[PDB]
Amino acid sequence: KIRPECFELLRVLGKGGYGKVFQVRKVNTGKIFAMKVLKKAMIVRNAKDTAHTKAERNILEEVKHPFIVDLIYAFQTGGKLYLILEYLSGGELFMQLEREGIFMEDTACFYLAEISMALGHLHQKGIIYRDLKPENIMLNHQGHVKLTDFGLGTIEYMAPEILMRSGHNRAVDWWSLGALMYDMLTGAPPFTGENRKKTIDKILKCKLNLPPYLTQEARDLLKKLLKRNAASRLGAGPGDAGEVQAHPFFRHINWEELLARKVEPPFKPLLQSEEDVSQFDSKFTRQTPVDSPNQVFLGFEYVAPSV
Numbered sequence: 001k002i003r004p005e006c007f008e009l010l011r012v013l014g015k016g017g018y019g020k021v022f023q024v025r026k027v028n029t030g031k032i033f034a035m036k037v038l039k040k041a042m043i044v045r046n047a048k049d050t051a052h053t054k055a056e057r058n059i060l061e062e063v064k065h066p067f068i069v070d071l072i073y074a075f076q077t078g079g080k081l082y083l084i085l086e087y088l089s090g091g092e093l094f095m096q097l098e099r100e101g102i103f104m105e106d107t108a109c110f111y112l113a114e115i116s117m118a119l120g121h122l123h124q125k126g127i128i129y130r131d132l133k134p135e136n137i138m139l140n141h142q143g144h145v146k147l148t149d150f151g152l153g154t155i156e157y158m159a160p161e162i163l164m165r166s167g168h169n170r171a172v173d174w175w176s177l178g179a180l181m182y183d184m185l186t187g188a189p190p191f192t193g194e195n196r197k198k199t200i201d202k203i204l205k206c207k208l209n210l211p212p213y214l215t216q217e218a219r220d221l222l223k224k225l226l227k228r229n230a231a232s233r234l235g236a237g238p239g240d241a242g243e244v245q246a247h248p249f250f251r252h253i254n255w256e257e258l259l260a261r262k263v264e265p266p267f268k269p270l271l272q273s274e275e276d277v278s279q280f281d282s283k284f285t286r287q288t289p290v291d292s293p294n295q296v297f298l299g300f301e302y303v304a305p306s307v
């Protein structure tokens with residue numbers, strides 16, 4: 001049986017509006033895991049919210065893919081829900097950008113390539129990732145990507161139709177990718193505003209500024225992704241991911257190798273222990289790890305067939 005007590009809290013890894021993520025140890029004894037904690041009390045009052053929260057618990061169980069994060073255990077108490085994920089000691093791709101600054105082309109390429117297979121798998125399953133801001137991506141302990149966010153921030157990477165809530169499809173993912181790619185290559189997201197509205201209005205007017213040092217392939221791709229008309233974006237077509245991956249910017253990518261994780265990451269986190277936490281923001285990792293003190297979430301319980 002699985003209850004909160006099977007695990008001891010080692011660190012705080014992140015803090016969301018409806019909850020936290022703890023690094024924990026299973027007391028698989030000794031194995032480290034990330035424990036994501038959701039307060040039901042904030043969730044069950046909003047239909048659209050419990051939906052997103054159950055969508056998340058289904059998707060994580062259903063999908064198994066090298067570049068999406070795995071659900072090990074899941075479980076609930078009176079007021080909390082508990083997800084136990086593999087622990088991704090590479091941290092967020094956000095912090096990887098901070099760490100190494102603007103990425104070189106071949107570096108940017110690798111991460112985008114992995115991310116593109118991820119999106120491609122998801123789409124086949126009818127799943128849209130919506131938002132591809134670098135904090136919604138992490139790196140496992142070997143330095144490869146893991147999409148990690150299917151539950152319920154900044155908006156700069158979201159596409160127009162999404163923001164204006166005018167109705168969309170999987171192509172918003174391909175817009176969001178070109179904004180990610182921009183940010184990796186330039187160090188900023190393509191449309192930023194002095195504040196919120198400035199930024200949305202800037203995203204709508206959608207006037208792309210390409211820096212002079214971008215290769216021709218980099219520019220071309222970026223142009224075809226960051227198109228206002230979602231139909232016109234590369235990857236909008238029936239090809240989806242294979243459409244984007246075919247573009248020349250990716251001409252060095254041997255895909256079946258990449259998926260096998262046979263390609264060396266551009267940067268290897270070198271960790272010193274299983275729960276080395278050096279790849280995480282210390283704003284969080286310093287805090288004292290403490291879990292603050294009808295049911296529709298029936299049957300939340302999960303145990304991966306693996307473990």
Ligand SMILES: CNC[C@@H](Nc1ncnc2c(C(N)=O)cccc12)c1cccc(F)c1
Nearest residue numbers: 013014015016019020021034085087088135
């Ligand atoms: C990355 N987006 C933020 C997300 N944090 C994580 N999500 C899944 N796994 C993680 C792991 C890990 N499994 O290794 C390690 C550290 C953080 C996360 C999130 C969302 C809502 C409320 C939260 F508190 C946190």
